[PDB]
Amino acid sequence: GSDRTEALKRMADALDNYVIRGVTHNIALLREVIINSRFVKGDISTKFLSDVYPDGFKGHMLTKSEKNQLLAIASSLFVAFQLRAQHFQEN
Amino acid sequence: TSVNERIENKRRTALLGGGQRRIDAQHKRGKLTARERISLLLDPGSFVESDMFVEHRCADFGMAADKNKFPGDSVVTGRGRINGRLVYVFSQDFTVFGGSLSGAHAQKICKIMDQAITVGAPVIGLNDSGGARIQEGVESLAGYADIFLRNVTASGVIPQISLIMGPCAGGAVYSPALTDFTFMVKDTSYLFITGPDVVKSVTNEDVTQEELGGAKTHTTMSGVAHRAFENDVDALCNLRDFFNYLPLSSQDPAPVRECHDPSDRLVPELDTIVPLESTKAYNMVDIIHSVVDEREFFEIMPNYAKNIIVGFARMNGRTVGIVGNQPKVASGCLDINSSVKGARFVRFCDAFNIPLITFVDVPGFLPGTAQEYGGIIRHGAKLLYAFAEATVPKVTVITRKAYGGAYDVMSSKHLCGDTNYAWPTAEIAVMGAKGAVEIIFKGHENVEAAQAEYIEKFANPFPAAVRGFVDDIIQPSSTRARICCDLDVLASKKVQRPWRKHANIPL
Numbered sequence: 001g002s003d004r005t006e007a008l009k010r011m012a013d014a015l016d017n018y019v020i021r022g023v024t025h026n027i028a029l030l031r032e033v034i035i036n037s038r039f040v041k042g043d044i045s046t047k048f049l050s051d052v053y054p055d056g057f058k059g060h061m062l063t064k065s066e067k068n069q070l071l072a073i074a075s076s077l078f079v080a081f082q083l084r085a086q087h088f089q090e091n
Numbered sequence: 092t093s094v095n096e097r098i099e100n101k102r103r104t105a106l107l108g109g110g111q112r113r114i115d116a117q118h119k120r121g122k123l124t125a126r127e128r129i130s131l132l133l134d135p136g137s138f139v140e141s142d143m144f145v146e147h148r149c150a151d152f153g154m155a156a157d158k159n160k161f162p163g164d165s166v167v168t169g170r171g172r173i174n175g176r177l178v179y180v181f182s183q184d185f186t187v188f189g190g191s192l193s194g195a196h197a198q199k200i201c202k203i204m205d206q207a208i209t210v211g212a213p214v215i216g217l218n219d220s221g222g223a224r225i226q227e228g229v230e231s232l233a234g235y236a237d238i239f240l241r242n243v244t245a246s247g248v249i250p251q252i253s254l255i256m257g258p259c260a261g262g263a264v265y266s267p268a269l270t271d272f273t274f275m276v277k278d279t280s281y282l283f284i285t286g287p288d289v290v291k292s293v294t295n296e297d298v299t300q301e302e303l304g305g306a307k308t309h310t311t312m313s314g315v316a317h318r319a320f321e322n323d324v325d326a327l328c329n330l331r332d333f334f335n336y337l338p339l340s341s342q343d344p345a346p347v348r349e350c351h352d353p354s355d356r357l358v359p360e361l362d363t364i365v366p367l368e369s370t371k372a373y374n375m376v377d378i379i380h381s382v383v384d385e386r387e388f389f390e391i392m393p394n395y396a397k398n399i400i401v402g403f404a405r406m407n408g409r410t411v412g413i414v415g416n417q418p419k420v421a422s423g424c425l426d427i428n429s430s431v432k433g434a435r436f437v438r439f440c441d442a443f444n445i446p447l448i449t450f451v452d453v454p455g456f457l458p459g460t461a462q463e464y465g466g467i468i469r470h471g472a473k474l475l476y477a478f479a480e481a482t483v484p485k486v487t488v489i490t491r492k493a494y495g496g497a498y499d500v501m502s503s504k505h506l507c508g509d510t511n512y513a514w515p516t517a518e519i520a521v522m523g524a525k526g527a528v529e530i531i532f533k534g535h536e537n538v539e540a541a542q543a544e545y546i547e548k549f550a551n552p553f554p555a556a557v558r559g560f561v562d563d564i565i566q567p568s569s570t571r572a573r574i575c576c577d578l579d580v581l582a583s584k585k586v587q588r589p590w591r592k593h594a595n596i597p598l
């Protein structure tokens with residue numbers, strides 16, 4: 001990027017657009033580090049991962065709005081599948 | 092009371108089946124009532140019921156008492172729609188006389204079956220019944236036969252599906268056996284002609300109902316059931332999904348629905364799936380998932396005779412049947428159970444105009460005295476005949492080995508196949524290279540040079556390709572595209588055969 005913010009934003013977007021199937025992968029951790037408020041402020045050290053995740057990595061934690069968005073997306077996808085199930089060709 | 096009020100009374104009584112306490116007892120077992128099952132299975136507001144007020148006419152053993160009269164008489168029958176397509180359904184009501192079959196029960200089932208055959212729509216039966224109603228004696232037997240005949244008359248005309256959702260014993264077990272597909276619910280359904288008590292009394296064997304006829308037994312050992320589901324709800328959802336695949340009758344082509352997966356999508360992951368060394372196995376299910384639309388595959392008998400794989404999928408939105416050898420299990424060798432499992436699926440697919448796709452990697456048939464004494468010859472002939480008889484489009488891809496008569500059985504081009512393809516790892520030969528060299532050159536000391544020349548000249552797909560046994564040798568990554576193209580060309584395939592009442596398949 002032209003500045004640090006642009007580079008971090010394009011990364012987050014790149015990690016969300018990365019398709020890897022057949023193995024487990026660390027994209028979830030990488031994506032969470034890149035958006036973490038300490039990392040974005042540059043408040044980082046060699047202990048960053050132990051300090052930010054003492055219990056362990058539990059994956060992203062959704063805010064009420066994020067949870068509502070995820071639920072809406074899932075419901076829309078379910079309804080879209082159900083609807084496509086009804087589109088037979090002419091008989 | 093007026094006639095109208097008696098009508099509401101009868102409607103209300105029928106809607107409750109055998110009573111609220113019976114319904115509660117049913118629920119505590121973890122089972123749904125017949126009407127709840129119908130509601131879950133059909134499109135909302137589409138169920139039209141038939142013969143609500145039909146009652147049994149038995150007059151023996153106090154069966155004519157008003158307390159023994161139930162409107163509907165332990166079965167709910169009618170029609171509905173699944174995803175907008177017409178279907179006829181009957182559901183057995185366990186809360187009325189334990190779901191025993193009486194004259195009226197069989198009469199209602201036969202009425203719906205006759206209607207379905209008249210209009211040409213599939214039939215779905217949810218089975219939960221103790222057996223014949225002993226109080227009606229021979230009458231019950233007659234009803235069973237009336238059903239059986241219709242099943243046989245409907246075979247190959249309209250698809251028939253059975254879902255065992257409760258106890259099912261005695262002659263009642265035979266009707267599901269005559270249908271095309273049988274599904275079972277785990278831990279709450281079972282099938283057996285004779286119960287455990289008679290088994291103990293006669294053969295001095297100790298067994299439970301689950302062991303004798305549980306879903307696991309009939310999905311892993313007897314090869315009677317095609318799928319087992321966790322719950323009534325899960326079973327019904329999967330039943331709707333499965334029904335989406337089938338055509339309504341044998342007069343209709345394979346269903347074609349809206350498709351988003353491009354028909355020319357490449358599959359580079361297949362270019363190295365097959366190991367070079369013939370001593371290492373791979374998973375054919377991975378290839379099947381890669382090739383089919385959206386990686387969606389409805390497998391049949393997934394836990395029975397795992398050395399072969401059969402199922403339903405879609406190519407470019409068109410329903411197709413998949414048959415493939417499984418090198419991951421028993422080296423992919425054919426045997427009795429796998430032969431039967433493949434043969435019946437192939438015959439069903441052919442009967443209803445569903446194209447067939449085959450993936451071939453087979454070294455031969457399983458050896459041993461157990462296979463010979465079990466009649467491996469006739470069982471393998473079953474699958475061979477199934478492929479030879481089919482007139483639907485047939486597409487075959489050889490990934491690795493195809494040796495001896497097993498190559499012929501697996502839809503070889505000589506069985507009037509349509510298109511046959513070979514991957515670069517294909518090997519079409521009478522037998523293994525070492526055995527062929529032993530037989531041919533035995534009695535010559537310079538074995539090594541002759542064996543090297545033989546392997547160089549024959550341990551590859553060239554011998555078949557040069558004779559036209561395979562239409563082409565294709566890069567694995569293009570597989571899907573090729574198949575799709577062929578399925579578009581062969582959709583209008585038509586073949587002429589000599590007249591006959593029917594064939595005589597080995598049994």
Ligand SMILES: O=CCCCC[C@@H]1SC[C@@H]2NC(=O)N[C@@H]21
Nearest residue numbers: 421422424453454455456457458
């Ligand atoms: O011990 C290995 C030598 C013989 C193995 C022959 C295999 S068994 C599976 C396949 N079916 C046959 O008839 N031959 C091969």
